[PDB]
């Protein structure tokens with residue numbers, strides 16, 4: 001066997017025999033999470049059990065999507081790092097276990113606790129998000145669901161992006177781009193406006209908007225655009241940013257939505273210095289550029305990394321790209337028998353993998369020479 005059984009969240013939890021489960025960490029619609037300790041090296045790990053993966057066709061394509069993407073982004077300082085995977089009962093399995101680097105809480109919890117944070121904290125948090133996002137975008141991947149709940153933090157307040165279940169491809173070819181699949185809908189409070197206004201402009205700007213929502217939530221201690229439905233969400237956004245111009249209005253690809261926005265009374269822009277009168281002026285200037293209503297005027301990731309707000313942290317020699325792009329050919333598969341085969345292949349191939357001029361060089365060549 002080589003495995004142990006634990007009882008957590010009123011179910012079974014089958015782990016490698018080298019570990020001991022220690023604490024429950026939470027639930028979701030997609031699995032349960034516990035913390036553990038390697039009884040040998042003493043390092044801590046988190047163990048995530050994806051549940052009921054072959055109950056619906058959409059849960060199965062979600063798990064395969066997350067498995068492949070976590071492998072593609074291993075080894076970045078600002079992305080959660082996958083260590084191992086395991087399928088305990090391969091004959092009739094309906095779950096897979098992921099072994100990941102262990103963190104302490106998420107950013108939503110820190111904001112909820114009311115613990116005081118300085119402006120240097122805001123700078124560090126926003127810079128780390130942008131470094132991880134630049135890596136992801138360089139592989140032509142859109143995250144699509146950035147928010148404080150998907151950002152893990154530890155005691156040193158280092159930050160790591162997680163949860164790739166909603167990610168989607170991007171291509172400069174608009175026929176290629178129009179063909180990437182979107183199984184689920186993102187969290188309403190952080191979703192960019194051009195998605196519900198039918199701009200047909202699914203670009204990397206959709207992730208930049210979410211980062212702006214996060215900086216605004218940090219500055220006010222509470223979510224910034226907090227709609228109860230989509231109409232309420234649109235009203236709260238126009239109330240802050242104001243009536244759009246004629247170019248922007250014509251871009252609304254939906255007739256009922258364009259008719260509604262065109263008929264509202266005039267609304268002036270509320271300047272961010274009036275909403276956060278005690279904040280760093282550089283913070284509000286970057287906030288204004290990330291929360292641009294029209295995606296064509298919105299700041300890019302690389303422009304944001306160069307903004308004066310972040311000049312202490314910025315070092316382009318420390319902000320890498322991903323070596324290769326990610327391929328989304330698997331999402332075409334629509335047979336659940338094929339998807340069980342692909343998942344088994346991913347796990348066994350990964351398990352085998354993880355178990356496998358400067359001055360000194362110039363002087364070594366000169367020494368072997370003189371000798």
Ligand SMILES: Nc1ncnc2c1ncn2[C@@H]1O[C@H](COP(=O)(O)O)[C@@H](O)[C@H]1O
Pocket residue numbers: 025026027028029031032033046080100101102103104105106152162163
């Ligand atoms: N690598 C990790 N380290 C520590 N806690 C985590 C980790 N991944 C997820 N969690 C937490 O486990 C819970 C489950 O979240 P979910 O990703 O929705 O299943 C949430 O409270 C997360 O913040």
